[PDB]
């Protein structure tokens, strides 16, 4: 159930799980249905607002309906923390086979990742 992302910042993230998806192969996001991802990280700060970019064939969109508190789903330097996060995809969301999802989070950024194998369908 682990999938391949890419660390934009300093390697704070160790892994990314998505129910149903495996590695770098097509990860299907069903419109009108919840989308669940489990992330764990070791951030290098003491302290958290969540910011999600997502491009859909190069329509670059900030995601609506994002609960942006990290401590509503979950911290100090030099230790791990686990987060199991759900975004509900609007039924009307555009379909695409070329999607890039970008997620990142007191004095700068905590963690960052880029996933390129999501496909929006149904």
């Amino acid at each position, epitope marked *: 159930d682990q999938v391949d992302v890419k660390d934009c910042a300093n390697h704070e993230i160790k892994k990314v799980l998505v*129910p149903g998806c495996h590695g770098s192969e097509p990860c299907i996001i*069903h419109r*009108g*249905k*919840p*989308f*669940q991802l489990e992330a764990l990280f070791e951030a290098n700060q003491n302290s958290a607002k969540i910011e999600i970019k997502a491009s859909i064939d190069g329509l670059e969109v900030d995601v609506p309906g994002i609960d942006p508190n990290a401590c509503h789903y979950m911290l100090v330097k030099g230790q791990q923390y686990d987060i199991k996060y*759900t975004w*509900n*995809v*609007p*039924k*009307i*969301a*555009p*379909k695409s086979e070329n999607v890039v999802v970008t997620v990142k989070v007191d004095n700068g950024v905590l963690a960052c990742a880029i996933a390129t194998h999501a496909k929006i369908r*149904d």
Partner: antibody, heavy 121, light 112 residues
Framework: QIQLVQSGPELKKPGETIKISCKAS????????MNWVKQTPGKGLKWMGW?????????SYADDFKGRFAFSLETSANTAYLQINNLNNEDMATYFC?????????????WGQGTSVTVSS | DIVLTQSPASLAVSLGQRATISCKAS??????????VNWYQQKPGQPPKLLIY???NLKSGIPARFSGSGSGTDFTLNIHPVEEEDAATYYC?????????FGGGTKLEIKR
């Protein structure tokens, strides 16, 4: 104040076309899918498919309504349409438009009053 | 096609008593923590009206006399206490995958 109002009942002859309308109001039209639903007096409810006003994409049809049926929009007028071509006796039914929930969790929450179509010479 | 079978097809219940309507799906309607079955009420000459969404959520403005439960392939609508205005036909319906399907329905008769 959310409402879906359909065009009135209609007698059509076998072979003719009908364009049934479904005007929406009281919500942001482009944020919700519009589903079509067929009911025949004898029988129950059959989901025909749906159209997406956010994307303007090609509509999705259930197997029994591929080819003779066309869902369409006039988005500036908050209006969804169901055109049925080459009408036959089996098309004689009541057709409902129904708004899809913002996500699938919320069900088809608001329904038109229906449009009873009679097919007869 | 997900087939939805209602049991019973028809039911006669006295005022103040319980009406129990089962809906059986031919495969699971669960996805991502939710169960995608909704319950509708249709009175003669009228459009279906949604009572319950995602198996167990009571739609606003519907009294708590109506009660939805279940997950997976087995769903239940309970109406308790039954009242005169409940004379109608009730449909379950699944939004798990295309094509969305309705059950054949249950006609509720009020015993007097």
């Amino acid at each position: 104040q959310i409402q879906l109002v359909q065009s009135g009942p209609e007698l059509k002859k076998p072979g003719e076309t009908i364009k049934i309308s479904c005007k929406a109001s009281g919500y942001t039209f482009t944020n919700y899918g519009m589903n079509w639903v067929k009911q025949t007096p004898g029988k129950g409810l059959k989901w025909m498919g749906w159209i997406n006003p956010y994307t303007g994409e090609e509509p999705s049809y259930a197997d029994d309504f591929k080819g003779r049926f066309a869902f369409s929009l006039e988005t500036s007028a908050n209006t969804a349409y169901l055109q049925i071509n080459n009408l036959n006796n089996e098309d004689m039914a009541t057709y409902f438009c129904a708004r899809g929930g913002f996500t699938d969790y919320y069900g088809m929450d608001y329904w038109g009053q229906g449009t009873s179509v009679t097919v007869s010479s | 096609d997900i087939v939805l079978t209602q049991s019973p097809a028809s039911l006669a219940v006295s005022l103040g008593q319980r009406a129990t309507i089962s809906c059986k799906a031919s495969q699971s309607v669960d996805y991502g923590g939710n169960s995608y079955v909704n319950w509708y009420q249709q009175k003669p000459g009228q459009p279906p009206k949604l009572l319950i969404y995602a198996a167990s959520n009571l739609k606003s403005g519907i009294p708590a006399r109506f009660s939805g439960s279940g997950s997976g392939t087995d769903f239940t609508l309970n109406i308790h206490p039954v009242e005169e205005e409940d004379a109608a036909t009730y449909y379950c319906q699944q939004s798990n995958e295309d094509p969305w399907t309705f059950g054949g329905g249950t006609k509720l008769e009020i015993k007097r």
